[PDB]
Write an enzyme that holds these catalytic residues in place. Structure first.
Site, PDB file in Angstrom:
ATOM      1  N   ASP A 152      45.486  33.258  56.371  1.00 24.96           N
ATOM      2  CA  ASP A 152      46.016  34.548  55.938  1.00 24.96           C
ATOM      3  C   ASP A 152      44.996  35.667  56.139  1.00 24.96           C
ATOM      4  OD1 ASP A 152      47.354  36.599  54.857  1.00 24.96           O
ATOM      5  OD2 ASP A 152      47.710  35.666  52.871  1.00 24.96           O
ATOM      6  N   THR A 153      45.170  36.432  57.214  1.00 25.90           N
ATOM      7  CA  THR A 153      44.319  37.577  57.496  1.00 25.90           C
ATOM      8  C   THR A 153      44.506  38.718  56.504  1.00 25.90           C
ATOM      9  OG1 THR A 153      45.939  38.545  59.047  1.00 25.90           O
ATOM     10  CG2 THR A 153      44.311  37.010  59.939  1.00 25.90           C
ATOM     11  N   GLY A 154      45.552  38.682  55.683  1.00 24.71           N
ATOM     12  CA  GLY A 154      45.791  39.705  54.691  1.00 24.71           C
ATOM     13  C   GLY A 154      45.152  39.467  53.345  1.00 24.71           C
TER      14      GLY A 154
HETATM   15  C1  LIG Z   1      48.035  43.478  49.341  1.00 22.33           C
HETATM   16  C2  LIG Z   1      47.894  42.768  50.699  1.00 22.33           C
HETATM   17  C3  LIG Z   1      48.655  41.419  50.664  1.00 22.33           C
HETATM   18  C4  LIG Z   1      50.024  41.592  50.092  1.00 22.33           C
HETATM   19  C5  LIG Z   1      47.820  40.463  49.797  1.00 22.33           C
HETATM   20  N1  LIG Z   1      48.382  39.092  49.812  1.00 22.33           N
HETATM   21  C6  LIG Z   1      48.197  38.242  51.033  1.00 22.33           C
HETATM   22  C7  LIG Z   1      49.551  38.196  51.804  1.00 22.33           C
HETATM   23  O1  LIG Z   1      49.367  37.530  53.017  1.00 22.33           O
HETATM   24  C8  LIG Z   1      50.595  37.485  50.960  1.00 22.33           C
HETATM   25  C9  LIG Z   1      50.299  35.976  50.868  1.00 22.33           C
HETATM   26  C10 LIG Z   1      51.495  35.328  50.132  1.00 22.33           C
HETATM   27  C11 LIG Z   1      51.632  35.463  48.618  1.00 22.33           C
HETATM   28  C12 LIG Z   1      52.822  34.824  47.907  1.00 22.33           C
HETATM   29  C13 LIG Z   1      53.853  34.045  48.704  1.00 22.33           C
HETATM   30  C14 LIG Z   1      53.705  33.899  50.216  1.00 22.33           C
HETATM   31  C15 LIG Z   1      52.532  34.538  50.926  1.00 22.33           C
HETATM   32  N2  LIG Z   1      51.878  37.659  51.637  1.00 22.33           N
HETATM   33  C16 LIG Z   1      52.962  38.475  51.091  1.00 22.33           C
HETATM   34  O2  LIG Z   1      52.894  38.994  50.009  1.00 22.33           O
HETATM   35  O3  LIG Z   1      54.087  38.591  51.943  1.00 22.33           O
HETATM   36  C17 LIG Z   1      55.333  38.998  51.400  1.00 22.33           C
HETATM   37  C18 LIG Z   1      56.010  39.932  52.595  1.00 22.33           C
HETATM   38  O4  LIG Z   1      56.412  38.988  53.502  1.00 22.33           O
HETATM   39  C19 LIG Z   1      56.890  37.790  52.666  1.00 22.33           C
HETATM   40  O5  LIG Z   1      56.432  36.731  53.148  1.00 22.33           O
HETATM   41  C20 LIG Z   1      55.476  36.051  52.021  1.00 22.33           C
HETATM   42  C21 LIG Z   1      55.655  36.700  50.889  1.00 22.33           C
HETATM   43  C22 LIG Z   1      56.220  38.035  51.241  1.00 22.33           C
HETATM   44  S1  LIG Z   1      48.216  38.292  48.299  1.00 22.33           S
HETATM   45  O6  LIG Z   1      48.634  36.881  48.353  1.00 22.33           O
HETATM   46  O7  LIG Z   1      49.074  38.958  47.297  1.00 22.33           O
HETATM   47  C23 LIG Z   1      46.460  38.485  47.933  1.00 22.33           C
HETATM   48  C24 LIG Z   1      46.070  39.663  47.086  1.00 22.33           C
HETATM   49  C25 LIG Z   1      44.607  39.890  46.784  1.00 22.33           C
HETATM   50  C26 LIG Z   1      43.587  38.919  47.336  1.00 22.33           C
HETATM   51  C27 LIG Z   1      42.120  39.178  47.058  1.00 22.33           C
HETATM   52  O8  LIG Z   1      41.424  38.203  47.733  1.00 22.33           O
HETATM   53  C28 LIG Z   1      41.845  40.568  47.657  1.00 22.33           C
HETATM   54  O9  LIG Z   1      42.406  40.630  48.969  1.00 22.33           O
HETATM   55  C29 LIG Z   1      43.973  37.742  48.221  1.00 22.33           C
HETATM   56  C30 LIG Z   1      45.450  37.509  48.526  1.00 22.33           C
END
Ligand SMILES: CC[C@H](C)CN(C[C@@H](O)[C@H](Cc1ccccc1)NC(=O)O[C@H]1CO[C@H]2OCC[C@H]21)S(=O)(=O)c1ccc([C@@H](O)CO)cc1
Lengths: 99, 99
Positions: B25-27
């Site tokens: 997860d690059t996000g």
């Molecule tokens: C604010 C930037 C993003 C939103 C941050 N997140 C990463 C992001 O990849 C999440 C991962 C995810 C989470 C829950 C279920 C599936 C995938 N994907 C996500 O929300 O996607 C949404 C839209 O598409 C759909 O598909 C999957 C879900 C829907 S996080 O998990 O909340 C996060 C916050 C703070 C930190 C600390 O380390 C500081 O960064 C680390 C991680």
């Protein structure tokens, strides 16, 4: 380009004719942008993330350019903490993970 | 290898002597793992995403093997719906975004 990950992979996008910054987010299925004005019809939807669910406006078949690469797809608009470009558009610009 | 983004970029990881599935997860700035009982000291933390914040336990200098690539660093443990490997460890296995 090849983008390393020691910094957040933030890039400039163009949508609705306006420039913005967004995060390339391989963990997101969908593209979710902060509140903004977009032309055309939309439908209300819910999406869930790490902290629960939010209401979003779903815009279908929207033109959006990402670091000079064109995409046309679904954009969700709502109270996300940051603009995220999700896999639905990353696939269109030909983005892959490599190690 | 090269991982396309047609589907979720799920890989097998090894942590705490357990095998688990996690998203590259690059996000995510840091790695966040579903609830597990790790030994050692920790520090409380709050991380925010779509839907709001969750409380997690921060463990430091935790060893993780990601697709045969060893890494060591910070892991956040809490009620997340998915295991996500964040940039703090993706850099350590040589992961880039490419398009
Ligand atoms: C604010 C930037 C993003 C939103 C941050 N997140 C990463 C992001 O990849 C999440 C991962 C995810 C989470 C829950 C279920 C599936 C995938 N994907 C996500 O929300 O996607 C949404 C839209 O598409 C759909 O598909 C999957 C879900 C829907 S996080 O998990 O909340 C996060 C916050 C703070 C930190 C600390 O380390 C500081 O960064 C680390 C991680």
């Amino acid at each position: 380009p090849q983008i390393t990950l020691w910094k957040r992979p933030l890039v400039t996008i163009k949508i609705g004719g306006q420039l913005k910054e967004a995060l390339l987010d391989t963990g997101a299925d969908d593209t979710v942008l902060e509140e903004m004005n977009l032309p055309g019809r939309w439908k209300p939807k819910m999406i869930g993330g790490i902290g629960g669910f939010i209401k979003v406006r779903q815009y279908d078949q929207i033109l959006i350019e990402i670091c000079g690469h064109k995409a046309i797809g679904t954009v969700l608009v709502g109270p996300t903490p940051v603009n995220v470009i999700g896999r639905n558009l990353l696939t269109q610009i030909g983005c892959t993970l490599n190690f």
